[PDB]
Amino acid sequence: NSNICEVCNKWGRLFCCDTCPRSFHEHCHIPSVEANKNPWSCIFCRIKTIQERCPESQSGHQESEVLMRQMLPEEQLKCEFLLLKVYCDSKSCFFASEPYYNREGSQGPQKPMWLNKVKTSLNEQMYTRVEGFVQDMRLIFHNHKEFYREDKFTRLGIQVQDIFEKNFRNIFAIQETS
């Protein structure tokens, strides 16, 4: 197994996957690493299993169809994975915790959002459809773009949103288009 956390790339108290070489801090893994379970399989492994069990799940989908899906266990897991993939980029640090807004010439967003809030929301089963999760994720980056206007710091929102969007297309097998 790896000697660093797959998400944050640091050493520390790591839990090792039994079915691949990845390792995790407790709270870097989503969901948090389970108390017992021997063997234990990580979220990458559990997602691969879903694909292997149903190869046709990799055929193209329409985003509009994916958003209306109910958060049953497999969509729950997919959203957890997509959230994790965003945390894997170090630039997610800017969007992790609750922001605040005091900049000359800008007003804060009406509905602030941040990655740890989404994490908690997933954990407490507050989303009934994929749409709920995806809207909050997109809201994060939108609020950032709106607030930082022409400051070059806006590019952080663009960059992290691109990570989100790519992983969303991959995980939910959205139909490729030009």
Q: Does residue 80 contact residue 126 with C-beta atoms inside 8 Å? A: no
> Binder to Zn ion among 42, 83, 122, 140 (CB under 5 A)?
42
> Binder to Zn ion among 28, 82, 118, 134 (CB under 5 A)?
28
Note the helical H segments in 18-113.
43-53, 63-67, 73-87, 93-96
> Binder to Zn ion among 45, 50, 139, 174 (CB under 5 A)?
45
Question: Based on CB atoms, which residue is closest to Zn ion, 77 or 134?
Answer: 77
Q: How many CA atoms lie within 13 A of 86 on its CB side?
A: 30
Per-residue DSSP letter, 106: -
Question: Based on CB atoms, which residue is closest to Zn ion, 55 or 105?
Answer: 55
Q: What is the CA radius of gyration of the chain?
A: 17
> Binder to Zn ion among 17, 30, 82, 130 (CB under 5 A)?
17
> Binder to Zn ion among 14, 15, 23, 25 (CB under 5 A)?
25
Question: Based on CB atoms, which residue is closest to Zn ion, 15 or 114?
Answer: 15
CA pair distance 154, 157, nearest whole angstrom: 6
Q: Does 29 bind Zn ion (CB under 5 A)?
A: no
Site string for Zn ion, 54-73 (x = CB under 5 A): x-------------------
Helix (H) / strand (E) element for 163: namely helix 154-171
Q: Which two tokens mark 9?
A: 């790339």
Residues that bind Zn ion (CB under 5 A): 5, 7-8, 17, 20, 22, 25, 28, 42, 44-45, 54
